[PDB]
Amino acid sequence: AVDLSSFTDFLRRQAPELLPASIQLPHGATIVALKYPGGVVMAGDRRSTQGNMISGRDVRKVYITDDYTATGIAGTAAVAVEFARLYAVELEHYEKLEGVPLTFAGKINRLAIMVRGNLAAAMQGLLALPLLAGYDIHASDPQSAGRIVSFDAAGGWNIEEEGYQAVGSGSLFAKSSMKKLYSQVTDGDSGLRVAVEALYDAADDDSATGGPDLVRGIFPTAVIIDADGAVDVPESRIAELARAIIESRS
């Protein structure tokens, strides 16, 4: 009964009820993430649907999970907010127990185990497909430090060397859009535009992904992460980037 200093492993042994152990629900989201020199940005839409009905329009799907990482989760809304909270506690728990944060590779491995341990529930539709974005301080090069990691339902993880990735119902549209717009990414502001644009494109072709609501003023949420840590992009900066795009499509 080795101690892995894992908060979830602890819960499993003594608090199973707390864990989202698993034996139509709101779903539908598109999350994108890309690498720009010396940085990584990640954004997600705000829609939630049950069948054809819009169940939510303010949903937040991208969360800063520690000073240098964020996670966006697509799939069944229930299962995703819980996953982000749990993962953040797991990360900070190891740090307090061991006085030092996990290496990036360790953080990835830990998330993969949480994912893989949900495959059975995901078969039944309580799916959670996460996207991980982080900046590695330990990495030798700050400019290329940014990291994007995707997970398949069995826990397989890939580190994308392409520089962009997406997950969710509109992810194909978002990825094709970034494929064209990527060369325009040269800093954190261009990269954040391209991200908000890829998400606009996804909302344009997928009814499950909501685009910018100018009537209620709800916009995608984003997080950017560079050597100085992870930060929530302010609504207003996103709203302005949205108008820019809308204005420019007209």
Which residues of the shown chain bind another protein in the complex (CB under 8 A)? 2-7, 9-11, 14-15, 18, 85-86, 89, 92-94, 96-100, 102-103, 105-106, 109-110, 113
From the list its own copies, another protein, none, pick the one residue 79 interacts with, judged by a Cβ distance below 5 to 8 Å according to partner type: its own copies
Residues in CB range of 3: below 8 A, 6 or more apart: none
Residues in CB range of 221: below 8 A, 6 or more apart: 43, 44, 46, 60, 61, 62, 232, 233, 238
151 vs 165: CA distance, rounded Å: 11
From the list its own copies, another protein, none, pick the one residue 55 interacts with, judged by a Cβ distance below 5 to 8 Å according to partner type: its own copies
If you write DSSP's letter for every residue of 24-60 in order, what string do you get?
---B--EEEEEEETTEEEEEE---EEETTEEEESS--
215/250 with CB nearer its own copies? 215
From the list another protein, its own copies, none, pick the one residue 102 interacts with, judged by a Cβ distance below 5 to 8 Å according to partner type: another protein
The CB-of-27 to its own copies minimum distance in angstroms stands at 9
The CB-of-184 to another protein minimum distance in angstroms stands at 34
156 vs 116: CA distance, rounded Å: 8
The CB-of-132 to another protein minimum distance in angstroms stands at 14
The CB-of-67 to another protein minimum distance in angstroms stands at 10
Crossing angle between the packed helical segments 188-205 and 235-249, to the nearest 10 degrees: 60
Residues in CB range of 52: below 8 A, 6 or more apart: 207
Residues that bind its own copies (CB under 8 A): 1-2, 4, 9, 12-15, 17-18, 20, 22-23, 25-26, 48, 50, 55-56, 58-59, 76-79, 81-82, 113, 116-117, 119-120, 123, 126, 152-158, 161
23/100 with CB nearer its own copies? 23
20/37 with CB nearer another protein? 20
Residue 79 region by backbone torsions, left for phi larger than 0, else alpha for psi between -120 and 50, else beta:
alpha
The CB-of-82 to another protein minimum distance in angstroms stands at 10
First to last CA, the chain: 63
105/120 with CB nearer another protein? 105
15/137 with CB nearer its own copies? 15
Residues in CB range of 239: below 8 A, 6 or more apart: 212, 217, 219
Tokens of 182: 């990527």
